[PDB]
Design a protein around this ligand. Structure first.
Ligand SMILES: O=S(=O)(NO)c1ccccc1
Ligand SMILES: O=S(=O)(NO)c1ccccc1
Ligand SMILES: O=S(=O)(NO)c1ccccc1
Ligand SMILES: O=S(=O)(NO)c1ccccc1
Ligand SMILES: [Zn+2]
Length: 256
């Protein structure tokens, strides 16, 4: 199936997922000098105080920290969003080297990794129905740069050896996603899509300007994960990022 290898990578996805060449695909390069401040944007509200993480899973593409979304425990509101969006899971995209890893770029600059907190519009009832709507999802993207260690990420880092291969999962309760946010909520927003197949165009992207810093040791542990399942030839889980796609007929707005 799809992956990030030479024969099943981003350049091959379109054959099974035609929308890969669509009109609102993600990620995109964020040209800071073309994005315009938008006064109509309301203050962004990230309410993760009642978040309930459940477990962490290696799905063979990345690892997802899943949350209980049967109620409005962890939600995203405001900004360019209408209504309430429920956090369902978060994951990262990273590279084999510190100079690459992020999916979105800023003035062509690539970060070592990118965090994606996925939320679905509660007016659609469930994630499944949400991915059938143009405003069904909202993903908060956060860039990671190598520097000082990020305390709030260590818990994730230390559980990774228990989910080394595809299909493995482990309990991951009481994790606070607020520990992964930067001080400032300044952001850029634009209409986009999932950056992984099925590449559905149902996402309102909210990408924070301020990156969080993680240590070399922390990202190094991300790179020890496997794309393969237990017992198969080892393929390190690195460079699981989709490159920038054509912006086409879209405008990126800045909250600042
Ligand atoms: O998911 S894909 O990249 N679509 O072309 C793929 C490539 C090779 C074999 C199976 C799937
Ligand atoms: O797609 S997932 O991240 N892993 O299965 C998920 C998380 C919460 C609920 C359903 C699915
Ligand atoms: O676009 S993503 O944030 N990363 O590909 C995403 C992944 C799974 C489900 C929704 C969004
Ligand atoms: O574009 S990718 O397929 N995923 O990031 C890639 C694979 C190997 C090296 C760089 C990029
Ligand atoms: Zn992602």
């Amino acid at each position: 199936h799809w992956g990030y290898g030479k024969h099943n990578g981003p350049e091959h996805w379109h054959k099974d997922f035609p929308i890969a060449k669509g009109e609102r695909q993600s990620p995109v390069d964020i040209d800071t000098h073309t994005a315009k401040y938008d006064p109509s944007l309301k203050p962004l509200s990230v309410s993760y105080d009642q978040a309930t993480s459940l477990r962490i899973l290696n799905n063979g593409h990345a690892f997802n920290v899943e949350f209980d979304d049967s109620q409005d425990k962890a939600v995203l509101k405001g900004g360019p969003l209408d209504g309430t969006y429920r956090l369902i899971q978060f994951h990262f995209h990273w590279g084999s080297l510190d100079g690459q890893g992020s999916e979105h770029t800023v003035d062509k600059k690539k970060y070592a990794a990118e965090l994606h907190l996925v939320h679905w519009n509660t007016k659609y009832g469930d994630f499944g129905k949400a991915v059938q709507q143009p405003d069904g999802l909202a993903v908060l993207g956060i860039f990671l740069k190598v520097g000082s260690a990020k305390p709030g990420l260590q818990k994730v880092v230390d559980v990774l050896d228990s989910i080394k291969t595809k299909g493995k999962s482990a309990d991951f309760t009481n994790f606070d996603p607020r520990g992964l946010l930067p001080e400032s909520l300044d952001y850029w927003t634009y209409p986009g899509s999932l950056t992984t197949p099925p590449l559905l165009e149902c996402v309102t992207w909210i990408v924070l300007k301020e990156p969080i810093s993680v240590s070399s040791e922390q990202v190094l542990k991300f790179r020890k994960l496997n794309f393969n399942g237990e017992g198969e030839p080892e393929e390190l889980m690195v460079d699981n990022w989709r490159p920038a796609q054509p912006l086409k007929n879209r405008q990126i707005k800045a909250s600042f």
